[PDB]
Swiss-Prot record, chain C:
Protein name stated in the entry: Proteasome subunit alpha type-6
Family of this protein: Belongs to the peptidase T1A family.
GO molecular function term, any single one: purine ribonucleoside triphosphate binding
Sites where a glycan is attached: 1
UniProt gene name: PSMA6
Modified residues (N6-acetyllysine): 98, 100
Classification via SMART domains: Proteasome_A_N (SM00948)
A single Gene Ontology CC term: proteasome core complex
Residues modified to Phosphotyrosine: 155
From Swiss-Prot, chain D:
UniProt organism field: Homo sapiens
Full-protein residues shown: 295 to 433 of 440
Compartments where found: Cytoplasm; Nucleus; Membrane
Quaternary structure annotation from Swiss-Prot or TrEMBL: Component of the 19S proteasome regulatory particle complex. The 26S proteasome consists of a 20S core particle (CP) and two 19S regulatory subunits (RP). The regulatory particle is made of a lid composed of 9 subunits, a base containing 6 ATPases including PSMC1 and few additional components. Interacts with SCA7. Interacts with NGLY1. Interacts with PAAF1.
Family: Belongs to the AAA ATPase family.
Protein name, as recorded: 26S proteasome regulatory subunit 4
Physiological role: Component of the 26S proteasome, a multiprotein complex involved in the ATP-dependent degradation of ubiquitinated proteins. This complex plays a key role in the maintenance of protein homeostasis by removing misfolded or damaged proteins, which could impair cellular functions, and by removing proteins whose functions are no longer required. Therefore, the proteasome participates in numerous cellular processes, including cell cycle progression, apoptosis, or DNA damage repair.
Swiss-Prot record, chain E:
Signals that turn on the gene: Down-regulated by antioxidants BO-653 and probucol.
Keyword vocabulary terms for this entry: Acetylation, Cytoplasm, Host-virus interaction, Nucleus, Phosphoprotein, Proteasome
Origin superkingdom: Eukaryota
Cross-referenced SUPFAM superfamilies: N-terminal nucleophile aminohydrolases (Ntn hydrolases)
Family per similarity comment: Belongs to the peptidase T1A family.
Entry keyword annotation includes Nucleus: yes
Organism: Homo sapiens (Human)
Transmembrane parts of this sequence: none
Name of the protein this chain belongs to: Proteasome subunit alpha type-4
UniProtKB/Swiss-Prot annotation, chain H:
Inducing or repressing factors: Down-regulated by antioxidants BO-653 and probucol. Up-regulated by bacterial lipopolysaccharides (LPS) and TNF.
A single GO cellular-component term on record: cytosol
Compartments, as annotated in UniProt: Cytoplasm; Nucleus
Lineage, highest ranks first: Eukaryota, Metazoa, Chordata, Craniata, Vertebrata
Protein name, per record: Proteasome subunit alpha type-3
GO molecular function: ubiquitin protein ligase binding
N6-acetyllysine modifications at: 52, 201, 225
CDD domains registered for this protein in UniProt: proteasome_alpha_type_3
Residue(s) carrying Phosphoserine: 238
GO process annotations (BP): proteasome-mediated ubiquitin-dependent protein catabolic process
Assembly with partners or alone: The 26S proteasome consists of a 20S proteasome core and two 19S regulatory subunits. The 20S proteasome core is a barrel-shaped complex made of 28 subunits that are arranged in four stacked rings. The two outer rings are each formed by seven alpha subunits, and the two inner rings are formed by seven beta subunits. The proteolytic activity is exerted by three beta-subunits PSMB5, PSMB6 and PSMB7. Interacts with AURKB. Interacts with CDKN1A. Interacts with MDM2 and RB1. Interacts with the C-terminus of TBXA2R isoform 2. Interacts with DNAJB2.
Keyword Nucleus part of the UniProt annotation: yes
Family: Belongs to the peptidase T1A family.
């Protein structure tokens, strides 16, 4: 469809003191395999990330306009941005086009800059925010993400069990759907330092 | 208008701005007011006296709170004051609509400072004759800022605007210091505004707004006569 | 203490003064009129006289009291055309209040708006400051009657008993002596004072036709212009 | 106006009669007239057509060789140390006339007398100079 | 309404721009700042105007502004008149970054801003900007640079500075104290504390009356460095001790 | 005299000198006299040239079949208001498909000339317009002014020493309403011929004549067209 | 916006701010240039460097195209504006009409733009005068000049700046076709003009050259002192 | 010194001389008066014969703005014709949104608002015109209004404009407002206008009488001077 | 007395326009001639230095095919009138598939002569002469800054305008021939030039009904020089 043209899926999950976020590496037009290097999860500040899924032009465009507004914001105020501020900012950015709405699925995963508090949120394409304490999923297929995540996620996890959890969720979530696949990258961040890995995904 | 719009403010032989100097003089002829930033939060103490006992002070206020956490006072001319206050009142909102969050004192002074700046250079119109003292409490630490006709701003633990502000400024230099509680700041603010006050002081002769880190609050003449009774 | 165009336009003098508005406040006295406002307990009274040089003058056209809204009356001073423009701006903006917010305007916020408009009139150097003055009344919830005075400095204020204009500066000095003491106020007390202060200021002691009494009360909340008959009743009532 | 005097136009009319008496009706006497000023802007053209209509000179600021020439003129009398160099002087300074560098000669000899030397040293010429350099930079 | 106009845009009968002269005279007073070449770094020093201890001083960098990740400026003139320019220029650089997703080179930024300042010189009868500031930053090519914003709309991009009119003796001091390729930012810094130790009229050189900020090269951060008072105090008193060693010859 | 700066200022006597100086701009043009009878309407204008080979500069110019105009003053505003005039003509001539009654037309001239007579930094138009036309009530001769106040006459004149032409007008102008086109035209040149100093003609190429009638469409006549009108003339006395 | 009469006709017939705005050019830095059969060499002087500072950031010569080089006078800022404008122009003439830009064309653009600039309300007439040199298509030499009035005018060699009448007075002795019959004679010829003009301290002298169809190049001041050495030894052989 | 130039500017006395000059410039125009009877309103104008000059029945200061409303103007003529276009279009707007005759009060109030609005700015000049306004209706009666170059809009039973003003409106007190019918006020105002304005001041002139009221059924036009022709008959015999 | 630039004189008329009439008195002088054989026009370039390149000065450019023109005083002010007039003629050729007459270009310029003002900018200081051949043949025209137009036979402008018009009306008649008018004109031209006559000093503007276009060229001119 419109959103499923380029395909793709983004998943973020809150750990104990940390937060995990992951997405597939694949790019392409419909059933055609194009390139597996494509980047979706983008850094904003430190100890905070953001994912995007949908049209790659809207992905890149939103990342650019967003990074613009953030740079002005933090240039004017020496503090780093808070996650809520970023949330309502992206919501404002998506509602600015009502009758000309972009096509994306913003997923924000980042810690509080003041404390270490973990935080996740996901929005609607016209700017409707949503916050959950377990995980926020956006992408092509439902039963895969919601299914495996509801079937797995636990309240308090070390970074390892969190890692393997979102890993199996993204693997078995991808392996049923053809438009998403071709490698998966996982970003797992904490207050102290950021850790990133690359899952081994079937290239089928 | 007629589209003339030429800035009437040129540079003097020394480069000074004539009309801005004169507006600074008009502020100096303003009402005596003071504010103190210390410890728990900010305390703003102005002076409003009636030229005739017909006047009713329950009607118009010298203190117009921008948000529940941020108030404001002034010196100079109310006509301009009310105007730019309506302006900043409207202006904090856009910031809210964007972030859904109270606008920081620093950012208020930033945007209002720019409005006043361009307002000097704007086409064929005088600058303001108002110098603002803005209070606010954000992120646990309160803040006290001061504007000028040219748009520049500073920060003080205590200061004064209006007649004698140098004298009472030096009084606040020695006496006021450190960080002390709302009770102390109110005390010494009633002393320093008691300096240039008339022979009698009443609950309606002054106005005291306070910025707690729980949020800004405007005191009533009830508490004004309560603490000041027993003046200083 | 003046240099440049500052006497011809709106800027600041060497001392910070601006001559235009002080030329306006004395541009009020060209009318040679007297505006009197007295507020009672439940009522508020306005009284103003007029000059009839010709028998061709219609008494109904030169009336200086204007009804902005059902509950809101007003009186002007100064030059005339400025007062009328002010009056249509007033009525207009009241109606916009009712259209936007759907409830009746407190009239205080009306003095705020008209005042700010006067400030915009002071700002532009290529526009005239419009030196007419404005006084209002009305009724509000649990506020009883109110009085407010908007002047062409870009500001508003309102008090118990207030008067501004030619001979009104001494009428305040008579007023403060009449108001206190402890004086309590009935309706006919505030009417009676409404005549007295103007009398002791003028001492013409004349027909009720020249003065015009505007009134508002919380019995009938609507503004009302008095008929000469009942006025003359108060006139032979205050003469004992 | 000095003391109690008026007025601007009467100063303009006394300048005017200066013109007519210079114009003039009718005086062939000479008494030639040499006029000068800093500013030619405020001077009224009413002067120039009667006189001086034919002749007026412009004063340029000196160039490198003129500056150097003038420094040689003023230092002709004063004995200077062997290490005194005019090049760095005329290059470091900007748009100075005769009495400027003549004044730096004067203070150079002043501090040379503070050391009671009949001959000025280039170091004391550069710092003593720096009193006028900083002097125009201070004011 | 034509007699009320001051005709600011027109020339002056000698060929000069009469308003721009005063626009230079504005910077003639007020701020006193400096800046000098540095290998693997750059230096900026600015005198803090109000020495009154009642100030909160919570603004962090005040007379110095951070306009970009790799760039910064030190202003001299009307502070708010400058602020309009900092928001402006910051927005320009930030929208170039928006465009190419690549840090803006200092040059086109400076020049474009200077032309924006020139728009009021060419027309409009407006009050021209009486603000003149400095520039620092790193680029892919020339590395570290310095530039000078002028009131006339020109940029005089240098390797040394004069801010303000007080600093002309500091320019002569620099020409006597110059060098080629020495940083040793510490050397040129003690040179700076020396410059203000003479030019700046207030003696003893109180650390809080002045301020120093540097920008050094890093991978890939390009560190912007604002300093605490104490490690500057040891540099100040250190340099005063160096003058105590210099008077040893007498 | 500093209160004569622009149009905006009312003089101490209440008279804007700008419009007066525009009138004096009208008085410098070459004299012309328009006139009508109870049937036909005629205007006569005298050209002036710069040198010998330079063409005598024309005045009378055709506008619409039923309406022509004379002129004096700035040629710029003359051709401008003339263009606006063609516009006005083809307007009603288009929508209503009828000619234009002169009255409401000239009120449109007054409305077009009004606004520049007031706004700051504006000027009036130097105008010597003399209009002749036929609505259902027949002949009309109007005249304009820089102040935009128009008059309706049996005969009027503007330019240099055109009041002398009126001093010829008064006597015979009760008779001008009677006679036909020809001798009315020679009455017209008898009105213009005194605007010349008495020592020169009144030749062919130096004069322009225009006539319009009830059933006669407006036509310009010059040189060979006025040679029948210029012949059979008795010379002025000495 | 801003609508006012910038410059009017004084009753003598002349404008003021234009004919008078030439005075900023008359006080501007000295620059000259010549055209030749093969190589065109311009000239500039009065650099007046602080000797601790960078010349390329204050650089006084640029190019719209690799074919056409720029040399100006007056104040630097307006030169920036007009230079960028002309760059956009030659770029637009490169878009449509694919050929390179002809000097007469661009110079008509600069000059005309500067004229309608001195026309409209609220515009301070440019106080800059410039020269435009290059190599024609079909290999011809080319130069033009500008004026505050905006009049493009083709010269054989350039005299502007301070002392321009003295400069051109020497160019009376320059113009003989033997100079330049050689290329380094054209270079040493422009250096022999600017050597007479102004101070000619052998340092602030700077020149740019364009040889036939070769792109522009600037000699590093080794050839400034070399050509000054041959001009000096030539003045010694003149004895 | 400069205080007379712009209408935007005040003066050390607190008024504008642009309005004074414009006012006294209107005084130089020929006397044109008006009066209202019980059944209508009688306009009257004296038009002067200067030289010949031109055809009679031209540039008459009597205008017709609406079916029931017309003008009798004085002062600068072009601006008065412009005001006739103004009020004409304004009655077209009232007719547009509503569809009945504009009450004279609101029409005069709008024209007063414009005339006022051109007195505040140095872009335009104060208007050089002063005119009479009158109307009639059965749901209203006969109303007359008088408008000045300052913008003050009130009403009379009768008023006087032009050079002869006070001496002309003096004996109008002999004309009774109600008791006198309009057909008689025709010859009344005829005798005022003919008797006033001595023939030596202007060697020749004429009389124009426009009329609106009940006799014409609300239609406003010139009650034809050849109809009744009562001026000359009476006015010629009235000189003694 | 600085007043609005739009203000009439007390006599009177527009200040700045009447001054622009004087602005032409100093410009380059030229002489056109209208003769039934064709229009011949001529100007003096007024050249200063060997720097000055002689072919770079043109006071005459051919507007259309059949329309030439001359200028005076200021130049880059005339450039706009010239170009835009070419546009007008070409649009006339758009609609009507013919040649815009020489007389209609005149008012097509002088109608936009004075648009200048501030609100709602400076008048043009250049006189023009129109040569051309319409259906009635050779036409020489003359226009001024104020827009006033008159058709001439032999007209002069510039500094020499006065005495050249005197000696011109002295030597003129209606029976002239083309080269006769050419050499008779350059007689006055070589009386009104300070430097001796050469190929560079002048340029000729000539148009004839069937002899075209022309324009004109040197080396014919270089012969006409010695033809005196």
């Amino acid at each position: 469809s419109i959103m499923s043209y380029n395909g793709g899926a983004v998943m973020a999950m809150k750990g104990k003191n940390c937060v995990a976020i992951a997405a597939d590496r694949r790019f392409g037009i419909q059933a055609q395999m194009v390139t597996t290097d494509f980047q979706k999860i983008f850094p904003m500040g430190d100890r905070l990330y953001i994912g995007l899924a949908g049209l790659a032009t809207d992905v890149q465009t939103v990342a650019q306009r967003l990074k613009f507004r953030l740079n002005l914001y933090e240039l004017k105020e020496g503090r780093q941005i808070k996650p809520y501020t970023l949330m309502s900012m992206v919501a404002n950015l998506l509602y600015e086009k009502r009758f000309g709405p972009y096509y994306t699925e913003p997923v924000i995963a980042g810690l509080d800059p003041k404390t270490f508090k973990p935080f996740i949120c996901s929005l609607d394409l016209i700017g409707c925010p949503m916050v959950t304490d377990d995980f926020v999923v956006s992408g092509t297929c439902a039963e895969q993400m919601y299914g495996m995540c509801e079937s797995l996620w636990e309240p308090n996890m070390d970074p390892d069990h969190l890692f393997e959890t979102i890993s199996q969720a993204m693997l078995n979530a991808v392996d049923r759907d053809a438009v998403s696949g071709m490698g998966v990258i996982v970003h797992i961040i904490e207050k102290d330092k950021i850790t990133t890995r690359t899952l081994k995904a079937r290239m089928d | 208008e007629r589209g003339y719009s030429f800035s009437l403010t040129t540079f003097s032989p020394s480069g000074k701005l004539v009309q801005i100097e004169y507006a600074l003089a008009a502020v100096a002829g303003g009402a005596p007011s003071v504010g103190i930033k210390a410890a728990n939060g900010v305390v703003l103490a102005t002076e409003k006296k009636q030229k005739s006992i017909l006047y009713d002070e329950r009607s118009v206020h010298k203190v117009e709170p921008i948000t529940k956490h941020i108030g404001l006072v002034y010196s100079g001319m109310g006509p301009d004051y009310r105007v730019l206050v309506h302006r900043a009142r409207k202006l904090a909102q856009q910031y809210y609509l964007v972030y859904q969050e109270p606008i920081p004192t620093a950012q208020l002074v930033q945007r209002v400072a720019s409005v006043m700046q361009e307002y000097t250079q704007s086409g064929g119109v005088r600058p303001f004759g108002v110098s603002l003292l803005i209070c606010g409490w954000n992120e646990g630490r309160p803040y006290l800022f001061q504007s000028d006709p040219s748009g520049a701003y500073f920060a003080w633990k205590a200061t004064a605007m209006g007649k004698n502000y140098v004298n009472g400024k030096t009084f606040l230099e020695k006496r006021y210091n450190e960080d002390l509680e709302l009770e102390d700041a109110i005390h010494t603010a009633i002393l320093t505004l008691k300096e240039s006050f008339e022979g009698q002081m009443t609950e309606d002769n002054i106005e005291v707004g306070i910025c707690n880190e729980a949020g800004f609050r405007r005191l009533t003449p009830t508490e004004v006569k309560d603490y000041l009774a027993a003046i200083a | 203490s003046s240099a440049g165009f500052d006497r011809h336009i709106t800027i600041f003098s060497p001392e910070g003064r601006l001559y235009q508005v002080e030329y306006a406040f004395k541009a009020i006295n060209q009318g040679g009129l007297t505006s009197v406002a007295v507020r009672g307990k439940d009522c508020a009274v306005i009284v103003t006289q007029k000059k009839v040089p010709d028998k061709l003058l219609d008494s109904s056209t030169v009336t200086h009291l204007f009804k902005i809204t059902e509950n809101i009356g007003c009186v002007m001073t100064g030059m005339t055309a400025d007062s009328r423009s002010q009056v249509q701006r007033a009525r207009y903006e009241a109606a916009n209040w009712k259209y936007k917010y759907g409830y009746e305007i407190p009239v205080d916020m009306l003095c705020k708006r008209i005042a700010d408009i006067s400030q915009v009139y002071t700002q532009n150097a290529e526009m005239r400051p419009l030196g007419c003055c404005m006084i209002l009344i009305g009724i509000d919830e649990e506020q009883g009657p109110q009085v407010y005075k908007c002047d062409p400095a870009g500001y508003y204020c309102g008090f118990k008993a207030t008067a501004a204009g030619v001979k009104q500066t001494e009428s305040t000095s008579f007023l403060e002596k009449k108001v206190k003491k402890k004086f309590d106020w009935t309706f006919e007390q505030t009417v009676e004072t409404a005549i007295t202060c103007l009398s002791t200021v003028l001492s013409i002691d004349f027909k009720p036709s020249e003065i015009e009494v505007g009134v508002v009360t919380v019995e009938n909340p609507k503004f009302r212009i008095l008929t000469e008959a009942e006025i003359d009743a108060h006139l032979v009532a205050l003469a004992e | 106006y000095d003391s109690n005097s008026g007025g601007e136009r009467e100063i303009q009319r006394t300048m005017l009669e200066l013109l007519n008496q210079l114009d003039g009706f009718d005086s062939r006497g000479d008494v030639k007239v040499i006029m000068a000023t800093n500013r030619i802007e405020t001077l009224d053209p009413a002067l120039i057509r009667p006189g001086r209509i034919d002749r007026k000179i412009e004063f340029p600021l000196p160039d490198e060789k003129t500056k150097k020439r003038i420094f040689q003129i003023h230092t002709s009398r004063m004995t200077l140390a062997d290490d005194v160099t005019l090049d760095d002087l005329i290059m470091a300074k900007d748009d100075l006339s005769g009495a400027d560098i003549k004044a730096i000669c004067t203070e150079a000899g002043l501090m040379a007398l503070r050391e009671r030397r009949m001959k000025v040293t280039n170091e004391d010429f550069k710092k003593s100079k720096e009193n006028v350099l900083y002097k125009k930079q201070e004011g | 309404s034509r007699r009320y106009d001051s005709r600011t845009t027109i020339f002056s009968p000698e060929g000069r721009l009469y308003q721009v002269e005063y626009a230079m005279e504005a910077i003639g007073h007020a701020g006193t700042c400096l800046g000098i070449l540095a290998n693997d770094g750059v230096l900026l020093a600015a005198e803090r105007r109000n020495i009154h201890k009642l100030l909160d001083e919570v603004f962090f960098s005040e007379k110095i502004y951070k306009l970009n990740e790799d760039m910064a400026c030190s202003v001299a003139g009307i502070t708010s008149d400058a602020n309009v320019l900092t928001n402006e220029l910051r927005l320009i650089a930030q929208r170039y970054l928006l465009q190419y997703q690549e840090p803006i080179p200092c040059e086109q930024l400076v020049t474009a801003l200077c032309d924006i300042k020139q728009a009021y010189t060419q027309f409009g009868g407006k009050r021209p900007f009486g603000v003149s500031l400095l520039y620092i930053g790193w680029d892919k090519h020339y590395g570290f640079q310095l530039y000078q914003s002028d009131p006339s709309g020109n940029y005089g991009g240098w390797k040394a500075t004069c801010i303000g009119n007080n600093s002309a003796a500091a320019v002569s001091m620099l020409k006597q104290d110059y060098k080629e390729g020495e940083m040793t930012l510490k050397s040129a810094l003690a040179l700076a504390i020396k410059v203000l130790n003479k030019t700046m009229d207030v003696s003893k050189l109180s650390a809080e009356k002045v301020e120093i900020a540097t920008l050094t090269r890093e991978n890939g951060k390009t560190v912007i460095r604002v300093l605490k008072q104490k490690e500057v105090e040891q540099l100040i008193k250190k340099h005063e001790e160096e003058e105590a060693k210099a008077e040893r010859e007498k | 005299n500093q209160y004569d700066n622009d149009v905006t200022v009312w003089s101490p006597q209440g008279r804007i000198h700008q419009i007066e100086y525009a009138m004096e701009a009208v008085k410098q043009g070459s004299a012309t006299v328009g006139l009508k009878s109870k049937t036909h309407a005629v205007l006569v204008a005298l050209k002036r040239a710069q040198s010998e080979l330079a063409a005598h500069q024309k005045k009378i110019l055709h506008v619409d079949n039923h309406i022509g105009i004379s002129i004096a003053g700035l040629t710029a505003d003359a051709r401008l208001l003339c263009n606006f005039m063609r516009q006005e003509c083809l307007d009603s001539r288009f929508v209503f498909d009828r000619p234009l009654p002169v009255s409401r037309l000239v009120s449109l001239i007054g409305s077009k000339t009004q606004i520049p007579t007031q706004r700051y930094g504006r000027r009036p138009y130097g105008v010597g317009l003399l209009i002749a036309g036929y609505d259902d009530m027949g002949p009309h001769i109007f005249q304009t002014c820089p102040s935009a106040n128009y008059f309706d006459c049996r005969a009027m004149s503007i330019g240099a020493r055109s009041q002398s032409a009126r001093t010829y007008l008064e006597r015979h102008m009760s008779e001008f309403m009677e006679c036909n086109l020809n001798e009315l035209v020679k009455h017209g040149l008898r009105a213009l011929r005194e605007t010349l100093p008495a020592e020169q003609d009144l030749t062919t190429k130096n004069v322009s004549i225009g006539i319009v009638g009830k059933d006669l469409e407006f036509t310009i006549y010059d040189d060979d067209d006025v040679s029948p009108f210029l012949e059979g003339l008795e010379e002025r006395p000495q | 916006s801003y609508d006012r009469a910038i410059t009017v006709f004084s009753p003598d017939g002349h404008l003021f701010q234009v004919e008078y705005a030439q005075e900023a050019v008359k006080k501007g830095s000295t620059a000259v240039g010549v055209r030749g059969r093969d190589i065109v060499v311009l000239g500039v002087e009065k650099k007046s460097v602080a000797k601790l500072q960078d010349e390329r950031t204050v650089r006084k010569i640029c190019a719209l195209d690799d074919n056409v080089c720029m040399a100006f006078a007056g104040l630097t800022a307006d030169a920036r504006i007009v230079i960028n404008r002309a760059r956009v122009e030659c770029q637009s003439h490169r878009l449509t009409v694919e050929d390179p830009v002809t000097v007469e064309y661009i110079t008509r653009y600069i000059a005309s733009l500067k004229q309608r600039y001195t026309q409209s309300n609220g515009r301070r007439p440019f106080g800059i005068s410039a020269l435009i040199v290059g190599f024609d298509f079909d290999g011809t030499p080319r130069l033009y000049q500008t004026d505050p009035s905006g009049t493009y005018h083709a010269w054989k060699a350039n005299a502007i700046g301070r002392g321009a009448k003295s400069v051109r007075e020497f160019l009376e002795k320059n113009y003989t076709d033997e100079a330049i019959e050689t290329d380094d004679l054209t270079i040493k010829l422009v250096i022999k003009a600017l050597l007479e003009v102004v101070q000619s301290g052998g340092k602030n002298i700077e020149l740019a050259v364009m040889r036939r169809d070769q792109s522009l190049k600037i000699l590093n001041p080794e050839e400034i002192e070399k050509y000054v050495a041959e001009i000096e030894k030539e003045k010694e052989e003149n004895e | 010194t400069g205080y007379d130039l712009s209408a935007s500017t005040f003066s050390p006395d607190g008024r504008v001389f642009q309005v004074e000059y414009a006012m006294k410039a209107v005084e130089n125009s020929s006397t044109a008066i008006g009066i209202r009877c019980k059944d209508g309103v009688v306009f009257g104008v004296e038009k002067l014969v200067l030289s010949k000059l031109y055809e009679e029945g031209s540039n008459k200061r009597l205008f017709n703005v609406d079916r029931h409303v017309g003008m009798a103007v004085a002062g600068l003529l072009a601006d008065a014709r412009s005001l006739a276009d103004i009020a004409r279009e304004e009655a077209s707007n009232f007719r547009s949104n509503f569809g009945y005759n504009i009450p004279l009060k609101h029409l005069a109030d709008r024209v007063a608002m414009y005339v006022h609005a051109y007195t505040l700015y140095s872009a335009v000049r104060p208007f050089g015109c002063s005119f009479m306004l009158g109307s009639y209706s059965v749901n209203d009666g006969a109303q007359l209004y008088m408008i000045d170059p300052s913008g003050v809009s009130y009403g009379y039973w009768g008023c006087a404009i032009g050079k002869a003003r006070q001496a002309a409106k003096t004996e109008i007190e002999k004309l009774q407002m109600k008791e006198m019918t309009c057909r008689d006020i025709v010859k009344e105002v005829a005798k005022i206008i003919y008797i006033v304005h001595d023939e030596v001041k202007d060697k020749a002139f004429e009389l124009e009488l426009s009329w609106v009221g009940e006799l014409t059924n609300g239609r406003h036009e010139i009650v034809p001077k050849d109809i009744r022709e009562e001026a000359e008959k009476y006015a010629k015999e009235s000189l003694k | 007395y600085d007043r609005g630039v739009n203000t009439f004189s007390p006599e009177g008329r527009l200040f700045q326009v009447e001054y622009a009439i004087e602005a032409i008195k100093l410009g380059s002088t030229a002489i056109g001639i209208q003769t039934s054989e064709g229009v011949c026009l001529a100007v003096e370039k007024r050249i200063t230095s060997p720097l000055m390149e002689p072919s770079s000065i043109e006071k005459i450019v051919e507007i259309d095919a059949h329309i030439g023109c001359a200028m005076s005083g200021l130049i880059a002010d005339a450039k706009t009138l010239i170009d835009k007039a070419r546009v007008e003629t070409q649009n006339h050729w758009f609609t009507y598939n013919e040649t815009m007459t020489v007389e209609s270009v005149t008012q097509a310029v002088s109608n936009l002569a004075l648009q200048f003002g501030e609100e709602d900018s400076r008048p043009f200081g250049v006189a023009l002469l129109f040569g051309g051949v319409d259906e009635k043949g050779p036409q020489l025209f003359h226009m001024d800054p104020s827009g006033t137009f008159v058709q001439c036979d032999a007209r002069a402008i510039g500094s020499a305008s006065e005495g050249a018009q005197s000696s011109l009306q002295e030597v003129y008649h209606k029976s002239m021939t083309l080269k006769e008018a050419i050499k008779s004109s350059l007689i006055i031209l070589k009386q009104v030039m300070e430097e001796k006559l050469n190929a560079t000093n002048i340029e000729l503007a000539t148009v004839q009904p069937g002899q075209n276009f022309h324009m004109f060229t040197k080396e014919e001119l270089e012969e006409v020089i010695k033809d005196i």
